[PDB]
Amino acid sequence: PPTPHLDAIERSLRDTSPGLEGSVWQRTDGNRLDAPDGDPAGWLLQTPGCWGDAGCKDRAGTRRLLDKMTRNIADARHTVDISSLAPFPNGGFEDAVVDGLKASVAAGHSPRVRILVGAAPIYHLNVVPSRYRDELIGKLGAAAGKVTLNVASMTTSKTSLSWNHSKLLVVDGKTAITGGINTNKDDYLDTAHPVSDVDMALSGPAARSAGKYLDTLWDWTCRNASDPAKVWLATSNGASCMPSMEQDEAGSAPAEPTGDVPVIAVGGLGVGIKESDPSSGYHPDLPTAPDTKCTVGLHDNTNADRDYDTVNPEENALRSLIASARSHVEISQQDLNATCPPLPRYDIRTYDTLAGKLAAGVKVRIVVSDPANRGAVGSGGRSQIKSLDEISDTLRTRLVALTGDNEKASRALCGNLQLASFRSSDAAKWADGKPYALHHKLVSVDDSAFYIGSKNLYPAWLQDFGYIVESPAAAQQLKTELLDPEWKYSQQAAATPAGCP
Numbered sequence: 001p002p003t004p005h006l007d008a009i010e011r012s013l014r015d016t017s018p019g020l021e022g023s024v025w026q027r028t029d030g031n032r033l034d035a036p037d038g039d040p041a042g043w044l045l046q047t048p049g050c051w052g053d054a055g056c057k058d059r060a061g062t063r064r065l066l067d068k069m070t071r072n073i074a075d076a077r078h079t080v081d082i083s084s085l086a087p088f089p090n091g092g093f094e095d096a097v098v099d100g101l102k103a104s105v106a107a108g109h110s111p112r113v114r115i116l117v118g119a120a121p122i123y124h125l126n127v128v129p130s131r132y133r134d135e136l137i138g139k140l141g142a143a144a145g146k147v148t149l150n151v152a153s154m155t156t157s158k159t160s161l162s163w164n165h166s167k168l169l170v171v172d173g174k175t176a177i178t179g180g181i182n183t184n185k186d187d188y189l190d191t192a193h194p195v196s197d198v199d200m201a202l203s204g205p206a207a208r209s210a211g212k213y214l215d216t217l218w219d220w221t222c223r224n225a226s227d228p229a230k231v232w233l234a235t236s237n238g239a240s241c242m243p244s245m246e247q248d249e250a251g252s253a254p255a256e257p258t259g260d261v262p263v264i265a266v267g268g269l270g271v272g273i274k275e276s277d278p279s280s281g282y283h284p285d286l287p288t289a290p291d292t293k294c295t296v297g298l299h300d301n302t303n304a305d306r307d308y309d310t311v312n313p314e315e316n317a318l319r320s321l322i323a324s325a326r327s328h329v330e331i332s333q334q335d336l337n338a339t340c341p342p343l344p345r346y347d348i349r350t351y352d353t354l355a356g357k358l359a360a361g362v363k364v365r366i367v368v369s370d371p372a373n374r375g376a377v378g379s380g381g382r383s384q385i386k387s388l389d390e391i392s393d394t395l396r397t398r399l400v401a402l403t404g405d406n407e408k409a410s411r412a413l414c415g416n417l418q419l420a421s422f423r424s425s426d427a428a429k430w431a432d433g434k435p436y437a438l439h440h441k442l443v444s445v446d447d448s449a450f451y452i453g454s455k456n457l458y459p460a461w462l463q464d465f466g467y468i469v470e471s472p473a474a475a476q477q478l479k480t481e482l483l484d485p486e487w488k489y490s491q492q493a494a495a496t497p498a499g500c501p
């Protein structure tokens, strides 16, 4: 079956980062979206799972996520690979890891386990890698002797604010769960106002691609344990750091197909791991029109750095996914814009891509977390805008720079843009007064191809990872289970841009 959206994205990735193919990005065939029996859309792991249920008393999506995480780890024969934003997995996320590992050992296995978290320079890690390792060993009991642990917290650039933000669980290089969900009990479990988020589960060659991505992070992490300012590392049982655990498990044989789904795995190396993909001939004419509402203090990696693109192919993967839309594109995000300064306020090429779609008659929907969400920098579901106008006004600006006059800009903007704050029920706020917070990193185009992962569309220079799937059947499930319900409730919080009926 034809894959016109993946083909376009693949061309962009091979132009941007040819040397990173097979490590930081990879297209594979023959994957399976990992759904349980009798629940065909069950590969889509939404949390809390309460569409149209303002009370959200039964948080069935959260339970299904933790169950699936546990089962995947319980099935581990050789390797368990976990990455997240700090802190190390706690609460029910930790129970899933402990329970799964105990089951793997009870089945006769001696699994190797890597657990990697990224830490902002300002973030104080309460439970450091040595203490987290020790806590796990205690909870593992007698099984701890059979489990090889590598536990590490990392920061790759202090000045350029770069650390691991990818959210991955990869087992045996064969199954993978990824998305926006941090293993942080205070955002999803121990809370009266849970964040809305989505992960996906697959099996097949693209799970190995995720493993190769984590091998790239652990190669750097193991080497830079020589600098405790950057890396804190703890291992169990006297074990060495395992930079290439996924390659060792993969061996020489190619990954075995498990279904028929084509997937592009794509991530980025942030800042401070690798300065450029230096086999790349990528030579963009980077955007000339700068956001006159803000100026970045730091060097602008998002909008003004060729080298950064070459080691962060996920940036161009998302731009080319959006650019591939022939009929309609749905964007569901925490934010489209970043707090500026210190980061650039928006990705210029992304907004220019969206403006081009609006002017060409392509339907564009943007749903973001409500601006009433104000949290600390790094909180899930926070918003970085005061009003949805900051999105529509910027689109209007880029439209004028493209069409030439404001009246054409208005016809494109008013006729083809849907813009709203996220809602999951008829209720505007939670019972405890707090508003709904959205943490998706999702893009879907033409009900044919979609991204689910950890990479936000707003500017950020972190290590991130995600999958782009092209499958009309899977995108129909996504539409039915997530996108249509999202708009059913979010349209009650829609914006009418300035200058529109």
Ligand SMILES: CCCC(=O)OC[C@H](COP(=O)(O)O)OC(=O)CCC
Pocket (backbone or CB within 6 Å): 085, 120, 123, 161, 165, 334, 343, 377, 378, 379, 380, 381, 439, 454, 456, 460, 461, 462
């Ligand atoms: C500071 C520039 C990068 C950034 O702002 O990163 C925010 C991120 C939130 O990511 P997200 O939840 O919106 O996906 O949190 C963290 O990485 C650090 C927590 C202290």
